[PDB]
Amino acid sequence: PGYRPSAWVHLLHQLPRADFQLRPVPSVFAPQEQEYQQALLLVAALAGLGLGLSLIFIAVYLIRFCVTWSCIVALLAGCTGIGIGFYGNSETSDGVSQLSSALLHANHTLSTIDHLVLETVERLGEAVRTELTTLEEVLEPRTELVAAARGARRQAEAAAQQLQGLAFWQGVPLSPLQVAENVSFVEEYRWLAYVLLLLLELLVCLFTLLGLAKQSKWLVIVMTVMSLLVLVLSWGSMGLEAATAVGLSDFCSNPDPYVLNLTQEETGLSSDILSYYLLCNRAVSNPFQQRLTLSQRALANIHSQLLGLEREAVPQFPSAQKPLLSLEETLNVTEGNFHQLVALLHCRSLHKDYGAALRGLCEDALEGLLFLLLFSLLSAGALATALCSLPRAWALFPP
Amino acid sequence: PGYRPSAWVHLLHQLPRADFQLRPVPSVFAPQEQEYQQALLLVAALAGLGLGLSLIFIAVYLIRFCVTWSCIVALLAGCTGIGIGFYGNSETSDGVSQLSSALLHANHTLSTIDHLVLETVERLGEAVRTELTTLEEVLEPRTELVAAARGARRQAEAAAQQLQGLAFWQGVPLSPLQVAENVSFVEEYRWLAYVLLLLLELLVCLFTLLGLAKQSKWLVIVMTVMSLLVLVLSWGSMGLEAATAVGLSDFCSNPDPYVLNLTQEETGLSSDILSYYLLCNRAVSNPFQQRLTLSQRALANIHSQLLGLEREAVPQFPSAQKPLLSLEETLNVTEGNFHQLVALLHCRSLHKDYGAALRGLCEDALEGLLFLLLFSLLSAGALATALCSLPRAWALFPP
Ligand SMILES: *[C@@H]1O[C@H](CO)[C@@H](O[C@@H]2O[C@H](CO)[C@@H](O)[C@H](O)[C@H]2NC(C)=O)[C@H](O)[C@H]1NC(C)=O
Ligand SMILES: *[C@@H]1O[C@H](CO)[C@@H](O[C@@H]2O[C@H](CO)[C@@H](O)[C@H](O)[C@H]2NC(C)=O)[C@H](O)[C@H]1NC(C)=O
Ligand SMILES: *[C@@H]1O[C@H](CO)[C@@H](O)[C@H](O)[C@H]1NC(C)=O
Ligand SMILES: *[C@@H]1O[C@H](CO)[C@@H](O)[C@H](O)[C@H]1NC(C)=O
Ligand SMILES: *[C@@H]1O[C@H](CO)[C@@H](O)[C@H](O)[C@H]1NC(C)=O
Ligand SMILES: *[C@@H]1O[C@H](CO)[C@@H](O)[C@H](O)[C@H]1NC(C)=O
């Protein structure tokens, strides 16, 4: 099936970006780059200019002055906005949780791969030791039996070498667990902060409602400054989350060799492996293919040689029965482990995890960021109406 | 990792259920046991009883009668409730969409296995034809070359016979695509119905606000019966969704044996296969292992004597040199296809799809159903307050 970028991804991608140092920008995801970071900060600067324009407009309205139902409508609009904000916060938290689970499963898969390789090599080594025991048991050097034993030992050594070569995550500094725990850590703090902001806005709205119901002049003016502060906070939150959404949408564009380049810089793995596990198409062939065949061939060869020692050596050399059964059991166990490894070296083992990671990072996270945008716009409008209405009614109380 | 039942599913599982015929129900998911169906209908009956009690209480309130700010507070409470309803509808739609996507992916996987097995056996048949070509071009029957050719042909036939049985979804009547299509179909119909109900309640709330703001008595009495009807329909929706949530929670608690039995009754494949792909733990073992353990031998075995024809027949039989490359290419393609098949027969992919299906069906669907429960409760409370307040101030409207 694959991953299809959403409509919002292309809608935000086509947006023109500029810088005061140099307006032309490639509009291509590139962290640790001056132009991209400066443009993303300029987006928040534009949001701050919107803050300033709203403040000037409300000040002008108040100076020019210098209906309650409008205030109730504004606070109901704010309640709808904070519901949208709760939805968006839950959505983005779910998306980043999906991302963290994706890297957790990726680490589990890589661990399982290199692990199974490790004990497969260990079992092959124990098979080599028991084969040495069999040769020690072979006192009379028969023309064919010792040759079969030597061939089986060489085949076991070759299979051990190929299995040692199969492991690819061994010896890389990067591990997904360390880059998933930190992202979960940051996401937890971000969710906590936005939940606190949402609760503060709910308290502000409830204070407005209580002051209107109680007809308490004091309450109104006391929390008007808090309303102004939460308006400024919502404006700045819009700027920050809009920059985050723009960056995320630019990252989620259809071409993604950026992830491949970043991983090749960080882990240092060859591009053929990374291309295979990040594309999983018929154009890219398995980098582990040939080796995976060779080892299995050796294994098959071993079994054949084993049957020889099973069909001729056992009646002549009865003491070799138990070690031969030991080799047979090791062969069965290592063939099961080899099948598990081959199942774990396919694209779907990790390409599906990467697809789910991108799903959580775009189809969930970007939608959550847009819902935070809608939160910020609705909250700014509702609080502007509040600072336009409540002062017009503060002194206008019957007592 | 595995599937971990949540707290809500365990909380709803322990609830006691009763039936008018036979009170002690086993409280075990069984869509074929009648007592289960009457037990689930009893929840909707209890919700209807709550409807009746609320109607009696509001009628008593109006009869005993026979502040607007309370009405505004109730309307903002209803706005919060319908926001919760939006969230719950989106959550349950997302969960059922995840289930449908998992079922579609299960189809795509199984189709990949059986189509790939068909392609592999056809390629082995073409290899048999080319081996017959080698046999006919072998005019002089050398004591070793003809024996090697016969052994290669027999090994190819044995490998084809062993591989012909791998496809376990070739003969089953059930198709996951039809199940996914029908569950989707039902899902968008239910989503459309609930979206229409939510918009109807939003219109009711907006009409309430307009009636209070414009002091239009005529409108309020006209839409009072509308509010009563939406109250009744919300109570009925609460009953239906509560029954659905109870059933889903009772299912999600230890669903593996029930799903295994249902799939045994429908597909009728085998005990070992379904248990393997629904458990994927260490205790369950590969049922295809020996099968695969044979095939990967034969193909590899073939390669051995292929080198014989490469090492002795090539200088003697340049005509045989021509199709030997074709045979080797077929061997390479079938080895790649066999590795793909082995990667496709591990429980990891299908059990991962099943785990995602259960995740969407429980950890998302249960949350959606409980958010619908909250929607229903808050909507019932807000509408009860609305029918307790609006008749008071209908005639008390200033004009
Ligand atoms: C997540 O990553 C850590 C760090 O890599 C895993 O710890 C092991 O680290 C060793 C290094 O010698 C590697 O063999 C493997 O990467 C890891 N596996 C084991 C147990 O040997 C840690 O176990 C990983 N956690 C998960 C989810 O598997
Ligand atoms: C989904 O299942 C259907 C039905 O099994 C697949 O459609 C075809 O089904 C017939 C027999 O049922 C077989 O020829 C193949 O299993 C399918 N052939 C083709 C060309 O599709 C369908 O392929 C499955 N997968 C998808 C993605 O639809
Ligand atoms: C990959 O990244 C490095 C530095 O991170 C950069 O120099 C290089 O140009 C990138 N690759 C491509 C193809 O742009
Ligand atoms: C090899 O292991 C498999 C495990 O799937 C088992 O079924 C089979 O009997 C074993 N072979 C022997 C000879 O014990
Ligand atoms: C499986 O289902 C059938 C009918 O659907 C039922 O008769 C049988 O008892 C079930 N299995 C178990 C173990 O209960
Ligand atoms: C067999 O297929 C592999 C996979 O691409 C390839 O690398 C190898 O060269 C092929 N063998 C021959 C003899 O061409």
Author numbering:
A (entry chain B), B (entry chain A): 5 to 70, 90 to 422
From the publication, what sentences describe this entry?
The three human paralogs were assigned to function as anion channels that are either activated by Ca2+ or cell swelling.
To obtain a comprehensive overview of TTYH conformations, we have investigated the structural properties of all three paralogs in distinct environments: The structures of TTYH2 and 1 were determined in GDN under Ca2+-free conditions at 3.3 and 4.0 Å, respectively. Both proteins display a novel fold with very similar general features. Whereas in both structures of TTYH2 determined in detergent and in lipid nanodiscs, the two transmembrane domains (TMDs) are separated by about 7 Å and thus not in direct contact, they have approached each other in the TTYH1 and 3 structures by mutual rigid body rotations of subunits by 6–7° around an axis located at the extracellular dimer interface. In contrast to contacts in the extracellular domain, the interactions between subunits within the membrane region observed for TTYH1 and 3 are hydrophobic.
